[PDB]
RNA sequence: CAUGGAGCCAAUGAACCCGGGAUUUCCGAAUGGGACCUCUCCGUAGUGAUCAUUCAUGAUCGGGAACGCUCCGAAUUGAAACAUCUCAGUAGGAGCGGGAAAAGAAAUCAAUUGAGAUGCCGUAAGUAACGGCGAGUGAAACCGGCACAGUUCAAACCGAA
């Protein structure tokens, strides 16, 4: 099941945390000028090269 | 099998790990050297003059 | 004639094949062959030559016997297609003398010192031997010295690997002035290396 | 003004400074514990003020050779 | 960056700017051992490798846009083919290295008799010279300027001063 070390799991946790919708108050404050970031992906697509 | 999509199912291993010194996924796990920064080969950082046009 | 003993040593080494120095060569060559590439020796083999080249008996001054092979630049036949003028390499001797090779190896072995000069000390069918005089710039005795403090400068690092020694300037074509030195001063690179 | 100014931190004694440090750490632990359960804090300036005050106290101790 | 909510800080002079200090996870020259394990093992809390001394201590290692010095070194292309020649000591490689570096005080250049360290710019000049004497390659001295600066060892005499 892909036995991982500590560092690999750490990087996987970070790449997980980056999949987030931009906060609503950011969109309110910037006046609909920020609506996305380049860190969004999906698990069944291009594999991440984190490991 | 065939040279196309039939032999691309055995593509489960890895040949390059992640480098400690530069963070790029270019570390050859057999020769034990980074193919981008030269980590493992030397204490200096890999740079060649053919990585850019002759500046004239 | 009131003459110093340095003069007698100079005369004795003037023609080695016709004095007592030949027997000493016969004994010394065996011990030298048994040794390694670079070796630290307490006293210079030829006192007069060392004193002439700037040797003094103080701390921070080192002398070393280096060992270098004879022959030209051992060169490989080109693998791919040349043009029959660049294809041959057996008769193409190098462009760097053997004293320079000796001093560069000595510099590579001693990372903190700096090369001053060298001289010829013997040779046989397979090897040549030189002695290289090295001076330590961070020793207080050298710093206090008035005739040697020029080496405690930021333009004397790597003095042997940039052709600043005497043999280096001989090999750069800057041992003289006038005709023939049109393309060798103030440097080889300045004229696209068409000198030398 | 602040939870503590530099004058009061430098004026106090060693044990007084240490005790203030433990009180601040305990209050920060409680504040984080409440906020970790997805709740709007009762006063969401406390965390920043507390951390900056603790930074002041540690800087003062390190300057006075206390630690 | 980036004027949304709720808070906090600030006349004990904040925010901001100039100068100086503190904390500074792990890897990395990475340096107690080990890395398809950015962590892990013994903890003997760790001077890794090579060097100099009076053996207290000290030096080197990596980086830097281009510039600098030393050494190794092609082919396409041109010659309306092509081998000497040219492309070109170019592209590329290895070593060393600073705010600059290299050079530098005649065993020199002249010509009848003179000049007086070095570097850089102008000219000599596409000249002398080289060359299937083909294509092509190709200087220096004299002279005019910028800027100016000369000295230190070895030995002869004394012999630890
Ligand atoms: Mg195939
Ligand atoms: Mg270039
Ligand atoms: Mg060797
Ligand atoms: Mg200089
Ligand atoms: Mg042709
Ligand atoms: Mg360096
Ligand atoms: Mg010189
Ligand atoms: Mg040419
Ligand atoms: Zn790398």
> Kind of pairing, strands B16-17 and C61-69?
unpaired
Half-sphere CA count of C66, side-chain side, radius 13 A:
28
Ligand nearest to the CA of C158: 6
B54 has binding-site annotation: no
CA distances to C95, C191, D27 from C176, in Å: 19, 18, 84
- C163: nearest nucleotide, CA–C1' criterion: E70
> CA torsion sign, C180 to C182 to C183 to C188?
positive
CA dihedral C80→C84→C90→C95, nearest 10 degrees, is -90
As ranges, strand E nucleotides with an atom below 7 A of a protein CB are 2-12, 21-23, 27-30, 35-40, 49-54, 58-64, 66, 68-76, 83-86, 88-104, 106-109, 118-120, 139-140, 152-157
Residues C96 and C163 sit within 8 Å (Cβ to Cβ) = no
CA dihedral C158→C160→C166→C171, nearest 10 degrees, is -120
Q: Which residue has the tokens 């992640």?
A: B18
How far apart are alpha carbons D50 and C85 in whole angstroms? 81
Residues D7 and D51 sit within 8 Å (Cβ to Cβ) = no
**Protein residue nearest nucleotide E49, by CA to C1':** C111
Least Cα distance to C128 among C59, C39, C65 occurs for C65
- In units of Å, what resolution does this entry have? 2.8
How far apart are alpha carbons C144 and D46 in whole angstroms? 64
How far apart are alpha carbons C194 and C188 in whole angstroms? 7
How far apart are alpha carbons B30 and B27 in whole angstroms? 9
**Protein residue nearest nucleotide E110, by CA to C1':** C178
Least Cα distance to C66 among C121, C26, C13 occurs for C121
- C73: nearest nucleotide, CA–C1' criterion: E72
Would you tell me how many other CB atoms lie within 10 Å of the CB of residue D3? 17
Q: Which residue has the tokens 């103080």?
A: C58
C120: three-class secondary structure by DSSP: strand
- What is the Cα Rg of chain D in Å? 13
How far apart are alpha carbons A25 and A34 in whole angstroms? 11
How far apart are alpha carbons C68 and C38 in whole angstroms? 10
Protein CA at C133 to nucleotide C1' at E16, angstroms: 61
How was this entry determined?
cryo-EM
């Amino acid at each position: 099941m892909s036995h991982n070390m500590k560092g690999q799991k750490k990087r996987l946790a970070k790449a997980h945390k980056q999949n987030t919708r931009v906060p609503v108050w950011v969109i309110v404050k910037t006046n609909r000028k920020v609506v996305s970031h380049p860190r969004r992906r999906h698990w069944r697509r291009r594999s991440l090269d984190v490991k | 099998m065939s040279k196309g999509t039939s032999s691309m199912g055995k593509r489960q291993k890895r040949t390059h790990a992640k480098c400690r010194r530069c963070g790029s996924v270019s570390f050859n796990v057999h020769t034990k050297q980074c193919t981008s920064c030269g980590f493992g080969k030397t204490s200096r950082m890999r740079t060649y003059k053919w990585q850019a046009k002759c500046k004239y | 004639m009131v003459k110093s003993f340095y003069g007698y040593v100079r005369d004795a080494w003037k023609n080695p094949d016709e004095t007592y120095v030949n027997e000493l060569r016969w004994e010394r060559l065996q011990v030298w062959r048994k040794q390694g590439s670079v070796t630290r020796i307490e006293r210079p083999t030829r006192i007069d030559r060392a004193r002439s080249l700037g040797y003094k008996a103080k701390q921070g001054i080192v002398v070393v016997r280096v060992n270098v092979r004879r022959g030209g630049l051992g060169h490989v036949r080109p693998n791919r297609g040349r043009r029959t003028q660049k294809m041959g390499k057996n008769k193409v001797s190098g462009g760097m003398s053997i004293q320079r090779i000796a001093e560069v190896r000595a510099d590579r072995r001693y990372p903190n010192l700096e090369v001053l000069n060298s001289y010829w000390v013997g040779e046989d069918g397979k090897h040549k031997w030189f002695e290289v005089i090295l001076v330590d710039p961070h020793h207080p005795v050298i710093k206090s010295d008035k005739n040697l403090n020029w080496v405690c400068d930021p333009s004397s690092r790597g003095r042997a690997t940039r052709g600043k020694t005497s043999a280096g300037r001989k090999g750069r074509g800057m041992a003289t002035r006038g005709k023939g030195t049109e393309k060798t001063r103030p440097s080889i690179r300045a004229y696209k290396s068409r000198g030398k | 003004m602040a939870i503590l100014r530099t004058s009061e931190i430098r004026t106090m004694t060693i044990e007084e400074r240490a005790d203030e440090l433990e009180n601040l750490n305990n209050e920060l632990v409680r504040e984080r514990a409440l906020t970790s359960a997805g709740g709007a804090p009762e006063n969401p300036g406390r965390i920043g003020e507390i951390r900056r005050t603790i930074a002041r106290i540690k800087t003062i101790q390190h300057e006075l050779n206390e630690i």
